[PDB]
Amino acid sequence: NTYQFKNMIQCTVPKRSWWDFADYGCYCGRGGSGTPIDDLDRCCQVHDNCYNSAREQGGCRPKQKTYSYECKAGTLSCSGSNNSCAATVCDCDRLAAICFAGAPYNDNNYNIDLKARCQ
Amino acid sequence: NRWQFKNMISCTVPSRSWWDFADYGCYCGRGGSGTPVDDLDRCCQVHDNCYNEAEKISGCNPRFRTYSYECTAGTLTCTGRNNACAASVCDCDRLAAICFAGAPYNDNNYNIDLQARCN
Ligand SMILES: [Ca+2]
Ligand SMILES: [Ca+2]
Numbered sequence: 505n506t507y508q509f510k511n512m513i514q515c516t517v518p519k520r521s522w523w524d525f526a527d528y529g530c531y532c533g534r535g536g537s538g539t540p541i542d543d544l545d546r547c548c549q550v551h552d553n554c555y556n557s558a559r560e561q562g563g564c565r566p567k568q569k570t571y572s573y574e575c576k577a578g579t580l581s582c583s584g585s586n587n588s589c590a591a592t593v594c595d596c597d598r599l600a601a602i603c604f605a606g607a608p609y610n611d612n613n614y615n616i617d618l619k620a621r622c623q
Numbered sequence: 624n625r626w627q628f629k630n631m632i633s634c635t636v637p638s639r640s641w642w643d644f645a646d647y648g649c650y651c652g653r654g655g656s657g658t659p660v661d662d663l664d665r666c667c668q669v670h671d672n673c674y675n676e677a678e679k680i681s682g683c684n685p686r687f688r689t690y691s692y693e694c695t696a697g698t699l700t701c702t703g704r705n706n707a708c709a710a711s712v713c714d715c716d717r718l719a720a721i722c723f724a725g726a727p728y729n730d731n732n733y734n735i736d737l738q739a740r741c742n
Contacts, residue, residue, distance in 0.1 A: 521738070523737070523738040526654075526737065526738075527737050527738075533646075533652075533653060533654060533737075534645055534646040534652035534653045534654070535645055535646065535652070535653075536653060559684055562681055562682045563681060563682075565678060615734060615736065615737075617734060618642060618645055618646050618652075618734070619640060619642035619643065619645065622642075623642075
């Protein structure tokens with residue numbers, strides 16, 4: 505669920521507020537289309553695509569599905585308890601949190617004018 | 624489907640781009656939280672709530688479900704040939720596009736500081 509994805513980001517990126525990601529690029533929050541502005545925004549595009557695959561599993565609502573995971577040392581693990589929807593959504597979240605940590609963050613790409621930059 | 628929602632917004636508010644409603648206030652655009660900043664933002668809050676209720680229908684994905692509707696001279700009508708998901712989503716979209724057409728659009732409420740204004 506969204507609370508868990510926030511905690512995962514707090515985990516791989518302890519240096520930033522989750523809000524730093526919630527309105528980044530064309531894909532991290534609003535918009536959800538156009539050309540990814542940089543690698544971090546591409547992380548978000550992939551996450552969106554991952555959730556879209558997850559939602560095919562009926563009843564599977566990635567933002568609301570609670571899964572089982574652990575954050576240790578900075579290393580996310582999805583547990584083996586998870587049902588199909590949980591396992592899939594946890595993996596999406598995990599992969600995005602790792603991706604966020606590895607991508608450069610550009611302040612110029614926070615709260616961008618989506619209309620101007622995401623066509 | 625999202626493209627149809629954009630087309631409904633163009634049906635009722637052809638003076639504007641759908642992008643104008645893609646990140647407005649705390650609620651217009653993906654996600655939403657905090658206190659609605661104005662009437663237009665209240666429309667978006669009710670549209671997210673409506674989508675929330677439509678998502679209770681099994682397999683119902685508002686952003687992807689293609690429905691049947693008509694835009695006739697600025698009037699929107701959801702047609703009879705919609706299954707439950709389509710009918711619900713169509714109605715959400717129709718009611719929001721009408722609500723948007725009645726609300727004043729304030730440029731200082733476009734692409735706001737979400738962290739500062741929406742908790
Ligand atoms: Ca924004
Ligand atoms: Ca919204």
